[PDB]
């Protein structure tokens, strides 16, 4: 029931095209509001609110600190990038694709084809449905990209359809860990 | 291979 | 392309501190404050990199000191509670008698304080459960994962109970075969 008081700081390193373009951000929060901020595109602290003006001015008076922050894109961002490059930037985990039917309403027939794509990394994924070699773009609902919190992702891409005997449905998956599209078929 | 912490700066 | 975040916070009066490293939404490691030891999200990370926990403990002292300054300068304005959004799901499709893992995703909340309890048929579970620290978001809020490895059966139902100061009643998200 007592009041809470939170101090929260983030030091962000943003990488584009490997380490060719690197951006460094420092952010200071109290409770829910950002007050001070260092942006490598500026090279100085700036006040986000009037509450953070004393810290920005005082910090901008310390030349030794501004030089540390201005060099972070190299001494901090690019350094830490190379430390874990082998098991983060280059981490690759193949997807596990399975198809199984389901039902929109318990008392109705199987009118829902689920394409489960789980256990992959990174989060990038593209899934497509096909009826008899033609792509089905209408009637597709999905959970979206689900982060499992353990360096793996999953997603369900479902197709609302009435399967007819003889028809073949194909779930096609594209992921940076595989070269050619991955296909799984389901026959009625 | 050793990670580096940014150092926190004391406020006014 | 890629983002690396170093997130640290200190909370009063709970006196809770955290220091962690993020890579595109995932945890590389966090510094255990009591043990003063670098905990890697995946054991294999420790074999490829390192980090001296003393740097984190040093930053947490500064953050603790800055909190006192900002609490005074802000005239002791308390934080506004933001209740969490809770989701329960499984690591993979569910096959009977085939091991799996229930995942409770607590999202979009502040301050970073939550009690999370796994319930099997209403009874608490305190064996086999694991949990991550508070993870950063793009919008100054926090998220958190809890895990319950289980053997799927038709006789067992599960509930993830979450309690947050921004919640009137504790949240219960359900899951069953
Ligand atoms: C705290 O109180 C003083 C008035 O005594 C005021 O000048 C100051 O701005 C207040 N802090 C705020 C508005 O953040
Ligand atoms: C968690 O449980 C403890 C003991 O019941 C309680 O004191 C605390 O307020 C709870 N935390 C939240 C956020 O509800």
Automatic annotation (TrEMBL), chain A:
Disulfide bonds join 13-77, 115-171. The chain holds residues 32 to 219 of 266 of the full protein. Residues 95-183 form the Ig-like domain. It comes from the Eukaryota. Its main location: membrane. It is a single-pass type I membrane protein. GO terms for cellular component: endosome membrane; lysosomal membrane; MHC class II protein complex. This is HLA class II histocompatibility antigen DR beta chain. GO terms for biological process: adaptive immune response; antigen processing and presentation of peptide or polysaccharide antigen via MHC class II. It is found in: Endosome membrane; Lysosome membrane. Keywords: Adaptive immunity, Disulfide bond, Endosome, Glycoprotein, Immunity, Lysosome, Membrane, MHC II, Signal, Transmembrane, Transmembrane helix.
